[PDB]
A and B are shown apart, each in its own frame.
With several copies, the nearest count.
Chain A
Amino acid sequence: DKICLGHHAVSNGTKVNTLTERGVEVVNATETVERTNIPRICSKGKRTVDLGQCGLLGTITGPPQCDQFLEFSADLIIERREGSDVCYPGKFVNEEALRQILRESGGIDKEAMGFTYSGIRTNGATSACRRSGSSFYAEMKWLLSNTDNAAFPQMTKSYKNTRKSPALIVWGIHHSVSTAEQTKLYGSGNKLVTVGSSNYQQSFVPSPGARPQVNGLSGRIDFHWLMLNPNDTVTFSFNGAFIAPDRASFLRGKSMGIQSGVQVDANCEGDCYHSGGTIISNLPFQNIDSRAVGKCPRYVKQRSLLLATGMKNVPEIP
């Protein structure tokens, strides 16, 4: 009579790694490194905006592309490669910092700044900002002299943030194609624009000169921005080449922004994103994208790390 103690085993064994062995077979194992990508932006439960052709910074200035998003609200913000912040050729100073701010803003609330002008044109428009006809940035005012080559009066405009949140203020400096064009628009002589706050001080001079044609235009408007603390005031002193804001921006709350080139799905629920889609996984690691954002498993170099979920496999003696 005999009794034996034993353990189960399989012929269907899978190899794993230990401190000592490499490729030791165990009975059962599971993957710890996620590689299964969902090629969509799973947005269920999240208020989502697809800016498309509208650049994120464009939501503040307001090219035609961003007319729908001038006061948008969202939990999830999606930038697209086709997006553009600009109609009239130009770029933001410290653009990326501003993007990072807007990506988690929860959207923007616009409020008039209440600037009034006399002895001056404000109807500055261009062919690059076509909205039905020639137009301009929706939130901005292109200020000219009055007739042609006429002197631009020195002006001083101020604005106080009477709210409890910081105000996002954007202004633009216009760089004409020639000193001839600058004079035709704002008059002769050198031009200065100063922007004063209670924690900010900067200065700006235009730079007329020939540049490659972008959107048919050789002129440039570079935008500048600051955050205005509550009850603080910004003051604009200028005499030409100044793109004035009409409204200020206030951040709604909280959100997250991503850059993607794949469609959106309001059925799937996710919390970790990358340009290629959504990573939904309980696994600790992933090998899909190092720049994945949201609540994600840590990115690793390896595509596979098997965790033994069973004992060491020892085949039966036949």
Chain B
Amino acid sequence: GAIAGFIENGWEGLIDGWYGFRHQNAQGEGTAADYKSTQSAIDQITGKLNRLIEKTNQQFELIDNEFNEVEKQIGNVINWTRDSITEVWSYNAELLVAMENQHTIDLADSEMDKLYERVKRQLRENAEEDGTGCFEIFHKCDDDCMASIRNNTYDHSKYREEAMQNRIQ
């Protein structure tokens, strides 16, 4: 009945946010989403979208005819030019998406690390990493204490004695 964070697996139960907390104490188990990290990732992804929505004001007109086919020589030049341009935009589109997707994934992993590193700095010397994205807290941390961590109101000085004792022996 153990819990685990990121590093081999996500949470299909975290349904009110992208990033979140999952704890277990005497009160039991609980899961809550982090706003600041989730909002950052959403703002960046939506930022990409608006960027790819920015329409062009370039208007193009007919250069050939599909009812009355134009002269062969100029027609083939036109077709050759268009097909060349389509090759370019098809390439650009392919590369744009692949580039953006790689970045979207990476910035998402970045936010996860930033949240994990933040919590690590909050708990100071009162906890240890279990290697599954979780922190073993070496003191009693009730629901109120867990909530204090989530809203960055956790003062490590309060639990330092109790924790260092349990850690050292």
Contacts and interface: CB of A to CB of B under 8 A. Distances in A.
A307 interface: yes
A301 B68 CA distance: 25
B61 A1 contact: no
Contacts of B70: 96
A317 B8 contact: yes
A4 B89 contact: no
A177 interface: no
Given A19-B100, A302-B93, A7 B20 contact: yes
A82 B25 CA distance: 80
Nearest to A21: B47
B51 interface: yes
B168 interface: no
A121 to B, nearest CB: 33
Contacts of B25: 1-2
A101 to B, nearest CB: 7
A300 B52 contact: no
Interface in B18-64: 18-26, 41, 43-45, 47-53, 55-64
B14 A8 contact: yes
A259 B14 contact: no
Contact of B140 (A1, A284, A294): A1
A19 to B, nearest CB: 5
A291 B62 CA distance: 7
Contacts of A294: 59-60
Contact of B101 (A7, A81, A307): A307
Interface residues of B, number: 88
Given A3-B119, A7-B14, A22 B47 contact: yes
Contact of B89 (A22, A24, A285): A285
A299 B24 contact: no
B134 A103 contact: no
A260 to B, nearest CB: 10
B165 interface: no
A19 B48 contact: yes
B101 A18 contact: yes
B102 interface: yes
Interface of B: 3-6, 8-15, 17-26, 41, 43-45, 47-53, 55-68, 70-73, 76, 82, 86-87, 89-90, 92-94, 97-105, 107-109, 112, 115-116, 119, 130, 132-137, 139-141, 146, 149
Q: What 4 A-B pairs are tightest by C-beta distance, nearest first? A: A9-B10, A4-B5, A311-B108, A4-B134
Given A18-B102, A291-B62, 4 more contacts: A6-B11, A282-B53, A284-B53, A307-B52
22 contacts: A1-B24, A1-B136, A4-B3, A4-B21, A5-B119, A6-B4, A6-B14, A20-B43, A20-B102, A26-B104, A32-B93, A96-B68, A257-B62, A259-B62, A259-B66, A285-B89, A301-B86, A302-B93, A307-B49, A310-B104, A311-B41, A315-B10
